[PDB]
From TrEMBL:
Active site feature: 376
Keywords for this protein: Glycosidase, Hydrolase
Record-level GO cellular component terms: cytosol
InterPro entries reported in the protein's UniProt record: GH (IPR017853), GH_1_N_CS (IPR033132), Glyco_hydro_1 (IPR001360), Glyco_hydro_1_AS (IPR018120)
The species this protein was found in: Streptococcus mutans serotype c (strain ATCC 700610 / UA159)
Protein name: Phospho-beta-glucosidase
Family: Belongs to the glycosyl hydrolase 1 family.
EC number from the UniProt entry: 3.2.1.86
Binding of beta-D-glucose 6-phosphate, residues: 19, 131, 176-177, 376, 432-433, 439, 441
A biological process from GO: carbohydrate catabolic process
Record's keyword annotation contains Hydrolase: yes
Entry GO MF terms: 6-phospho-beta-glucosidase activity
Xref: PROSITE patterns: GLYCOSYL_HYDROL_F1_1 (PS00572), GLYCOSYL_HYDROL_F1_2 (PS00653)
């Protein structure tokens, strides 16, 4: 009487350092890109300031103070019975500026301490190396990942981590949601993925492709050094998977969707196959995009392919061919997408499409034939604390449950290889897109609001014991 998922299935929860740690200057930690992004809300972008200003509010400076409370928080993960815990190693804790010859021992010791605590409860760390938090010094001094020299800085950082934690961390990924910057029309993705600050007159698209290239090379180099240090390390990529559906069976919509997925997911082709799709090269030729791309990069990419594909899944998109003056079927994430009339959406307009997770699992499997890891899934919503002192987040339970059902079908009916599942923001943390506390994801409520007020007390939500039971039954009872 076995369950539909494997016994060793990696149930857990996922966060990122800059979103929860706080202690932004503790232990000599340097200023990161997250440290110069002000709070926003749905409809208003976060302000990216030229540094830490006096009149501005930076929610990531303090976040939820996990840096100090992690022992208590990890205890809560263990109560739910996490098999793993996904977080990032704050680049700026190890290399405050990014270009130092030696790593920061206080920073390395903190993660030794964090990882040890997880392992005390049998929780396997899962580590993302870059998660929207590169050293701001790299942005100002080198222009972020628009500079080839930054590749080496990243690989040095990676090597240091691989060496330090080679016997503590089994599962690694290189660049969080590396493909977000396919949307180069807005400032968020290029800043957070790549430390790109645009000036007037910039060819935003060309710059993005150059930075993406350097990151793909850096990823490949990091895969090679990690495996050289310990061949048993599982090192994956991380892509934001938003399936793009054609609006209708009009052949033009069909081609738009195919070409859009090509543009949004070519990163995965490079991570997995070790070379660029020819359609990318043709596109660059057409747009007169020039990329510094050497024979050595070519070799590195081919030799540094990943062991597995980590991905986030929250929603699906729809595209059509309505946009005029688009004879080459270019993809603009901010203009070509339309709403799906067959689904509901969150209060932040994120479409709710659990079945799309099954499509995504199959798409990755059919294209790449690698094991997969759902390393983010979540429902960001306003929570209210009931009279009983608990959030009765049945809406969050319903969302997660619906996706778990589909992922189990993908394993059980479709045969996809799925390593595990870590819901995003398992403890309430500072949101990425908007920098909000009110957009809550957690099984654990944290008392901190968007004016920075609150005790920071942790309290289990209704979803807390729900998920505990999910894990205990290995998904048999949802």
């Amino acid at each position: 009487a076995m369950s539909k998922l494997p016994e060793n299935f990696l149930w857990g929860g996922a966060v990122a350092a800059h979103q929860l740690e706080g202690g932004w200057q503790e232990g000599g930690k340097g200023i990161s890109v997250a440290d110069v992004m002000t709070a926003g809300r749905h409809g208003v972008a976060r302000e990216i300031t030229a540094g830490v200003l006096e009149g501005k509010y930076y929610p990531n400076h303090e976040a939820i103070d996990f840096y100090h409370h992690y022992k208590e928080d990890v205890k809560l993960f263990a109560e739910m019975g996490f098999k793993c815990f996904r977080t990032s190693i704050a680049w700026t804790r190890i290399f405050p500026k990014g270009d130092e010859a030696e790593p920061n021992e206080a920073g390395l010791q903190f993660y030794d301490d964090l990882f040890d605590e997880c392992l005390k409860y049998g929780i396997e760390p899962v580590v993302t190396l870059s998660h929207f938090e590169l050293p701001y010094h790299l942005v100002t001094e080198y222009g972020g990942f628009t500079n080839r020299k930054v590749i080496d800085f990243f690989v040095h950082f990676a090597e240091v981590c691989f060496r330090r934690y080679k016997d503590k961390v089994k599962y690694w990924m290189t660049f969080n949601e590396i493909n977000n910057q396919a949307n180069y029309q807005e400032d968020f993705a290029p800043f957070t993925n790549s430390g790109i600050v645009y000036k007037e007159g910039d060819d935003r698209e060309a710059i993005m492709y150059q930075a993406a290239h350097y990151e793909l090379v850096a990823s490949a180099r990091a895969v090679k050094i990690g495996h050289a240090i310990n061949p048993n390390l599982n090192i994956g990529c991380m892509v934001a998977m938003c399936p793009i559906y054609p609006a209708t069976c009009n052949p033009k919509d069909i081609l738009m969707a195919q070409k859009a997925m090509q543009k949004r997911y070519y990163f995965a082709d490079v991570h997995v196959h070790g070379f660029y799709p020819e359609h990318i090269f043709k596109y660059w030729e057409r747009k007169a995009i020039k990329v510094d791309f050497t024979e050595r990069d070519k070799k590195d990419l081919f030799e540094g392919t990943v062991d597995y594909i980590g991905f986030s899944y929250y929603m699906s998109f729809v595209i059509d061919a309505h946009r005029e003056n688009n004879p080459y079927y270019d993809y603009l994430e901010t203009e070509d997408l339309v709403k799906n009339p067959y689904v509901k959406a969150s209060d932040w307009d994120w479409q709710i499409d659990p079945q799309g997770l099954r499509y995504a699992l199959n798409w990755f499997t059919d294209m790449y034939h690698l094991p997969l890891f759902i390393v983010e899934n979540g429902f960001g919503a306003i929570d209210q604390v009931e009279a009983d002192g608990m959030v009765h987040d049945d809406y969050r339970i319903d969302y997660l449950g619906a996706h778990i059902k589909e992922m189990i079908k993908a394993v059980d009916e479709d045969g996809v290889e799925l390593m595990g599942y870590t819901p995003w923001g398992c403890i309430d943390l500072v949101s990425a897109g908007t920098g909000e506390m009110r957009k809550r994801y957690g099984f654990i409520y944290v008392d901190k609001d968007d004016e920075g007020k609150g005790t920071l007390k942790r309290s289990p939500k209704l979803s807390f014991n729900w998920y505990k039971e999910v894990i205990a039954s290995n998904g048999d009872d949802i």
